[PDB]
């Protein structure tokens, strides 16, 4: 139930001997250093905290420097927690190591990332609203929202109405993705599929919850 944090390196293909192209995405896995083990006695729940990447010393606060020093690890670019159970808290000690060995070839994974940000978007792109007529006398409402409600009853707009607003740049999970290849010496994780986000983004790969 624990995963690892990597960086989206970009997309490519893997060819099979039958001549099928598999769309894959490449994840750089630096070492996931364990910075804290949360247990039920102290925190009320079981989790593993890891860090990965690096920061320069001038960019790490005194509080975070002490947090990393208590574990014995080097400061990473971020800190991520994975909810675990007694089975997961087996060989996981503070200052310990999590590599790409966590996953096997052919294992289904869930991958989470920040989607690409589209900024402010209209209803047509954000919610697949139909466009109104391009011609036929249509005035200046070609990509307009259309009606936003009923009449006097209810005399308001219902909450959760689909409107323009910020699109993308949100946490998104894609489930049911296959591990195409694992390599740990090079920190390589090759996964079948799309992987939300841009290249260089932080991605979290966990074992698939559908199973």
């Amino acid at each position: 139930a624990i995963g690892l944090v990597g960086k989206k390196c970009g997309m490519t293909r893997v060819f099979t001997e039958a001549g099928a192209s598999i769309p894959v995405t490449v994840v750089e896995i630096s070492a996931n250093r364990i910075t804290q083990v949360k247990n039920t006695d102290v925190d009320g729940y079981q989790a593993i905290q890891v860090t990965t990447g690096t920061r320069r010393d001038s960019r790490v606060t005194a509080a975070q420097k002490g947090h990393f020093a208590k574990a014995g690890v080097a400061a990473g670019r971020g800190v991520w927690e994975f909810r675990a159970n007694d089975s997961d808290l087996e060989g996981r000690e503070i200052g310990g190591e999590i590599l790409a060995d966590l996953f096997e070839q052919g294992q289904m994974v869930d991958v989470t990332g920040n989607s690409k940000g589209k900024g402010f978007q209209g209803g047509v792109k954000r919610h697949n609203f139909s466009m109104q007529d391009a011609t036929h006398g249509n005035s200046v409402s070609h990509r307009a929202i259309g009606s936003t409600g009923q009449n006097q009853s209810p005399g308001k707009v219902f909450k959760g109405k689909k409107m323009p607003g910020q699109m993308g740049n949100k946490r998104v999970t894609v489930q049911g993705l296959e591990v195409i290849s694992v390599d740990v010496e090079k920190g390589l994780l090759v996964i079948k599929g799309a992987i939300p986000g841009a290249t260089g983004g932080d991605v979290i790969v966990r074992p698939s919850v559908k199973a």
Binding site: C9, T12, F15, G19
Partner: protein, 115 residues
């Protein structure tokens, strides 16, 4: 070369050597075909009208006429579906892409030989 150096490691292990060819050239591509259980090679002869050079992602489209109707196939260069490619005639064209040949049929859809 255009990608993340770690994408390049995955791409470079997958490269099939093939002979060089340009747009305008007439090529024969041997395509692996699996009917039910046996595998054979089907020939695809025609003019290379376009190609995108993208390393592992390279592709080239070949245009022939098959009994009246014209067919194009955009082969993926480094795909094991491509058993082999051999260049019959070398072309002398003035442009990378020969899309104008789609409106040409006979004595007008012919390109000069390169010597």
């Amino acid at each position: 070369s255009n990608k993340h150096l770690l994408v390049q490691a995955v791409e470079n292990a997958q490269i099939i050597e093939r002979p060089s060819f340009g747009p305008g050239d007439t090529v024969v591509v041997q395509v692996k075909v699996r009917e039910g259980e046996r595998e054979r090679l089907q020939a695809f002869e025609g003019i290379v009208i376009a190609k995108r050079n993208r390393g592992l992602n390279s592709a080239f489209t070949v245009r022939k006429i098959s009994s009246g109707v014209g067919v194009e196939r955009a082969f993926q260069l480094h795909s094991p579906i491509i058993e082999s490619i051999e260049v019959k005639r070398r072309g002398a064209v003035r442009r990378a892409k020969l899309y104008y040949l789609r409106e040409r049929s006979g004595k007008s859809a012919r390109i000069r030989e390169k010597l």
